[PDB]
């Protein structure tokens, strides 16, 4: 039991290209997205652990 539940929710993701369609189809157990995220990248970066104060 994690947070009381013995069940789990497994998430996956994808990048849907422009002018392209996505197709969800399920007879059960689907946890559907209500939202998507527009995205752009000039380059990548990193993730920093600090605990405090952006100035």
């Amino acid at each position: 039991k994690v947070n009381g539940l013995g069940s789990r929710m497994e998430f996956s993701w994808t990048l849907l290209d422009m002018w392209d369609t996505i197709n969800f189809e399920s007879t059960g157990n689907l946890i559907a997205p209500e939202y998507g995220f527009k995205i752009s990248k000039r380059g990548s970066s990193g993730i920093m652990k600090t605990e405090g104060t952006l100035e």
Binding site: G43, G46, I47, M48
Partner: protein
Amino acid sequence: GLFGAIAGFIEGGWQGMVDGWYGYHHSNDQGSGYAADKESTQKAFDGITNKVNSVIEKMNTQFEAVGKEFSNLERRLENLNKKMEDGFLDVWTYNAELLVLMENERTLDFHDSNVKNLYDKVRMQLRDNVKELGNGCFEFYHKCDDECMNSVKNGTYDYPKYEEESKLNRNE
């Protein structure tokens, strides 16, 4: 050092000279005092600033992002990233430290060469009109003055003028 001037046959440095890196000290009938050599000092300064600008400005920029980015599913790729980081760390540390040592050795020797060269420039001009004391000084076999001292410093000294007077006082 390498050219034997600084901490060499010229034992100490001059606190009294704030004017430059290398200069003269004259002691005559008028009065004593220090004076710098603008040419040699400025040349050295230009070279030295060009030196530290070389070891600083020649370094490549390269935007990067150092971090973990690898889960516990992949501890082999973590170890790979760690080997790489440390590999470069060992390279840059060793190279930087030895660079600084070798460059400092060169710099001190460079200064030594400059003083020695000024000494030789002077001695070559004065010739046997003076007694080379060996401490970095020259004792005149004649009577020089502020008007004559400036002649020595500025590169135009009249040897045949003081030739015969110096000779007689030399074999005195």
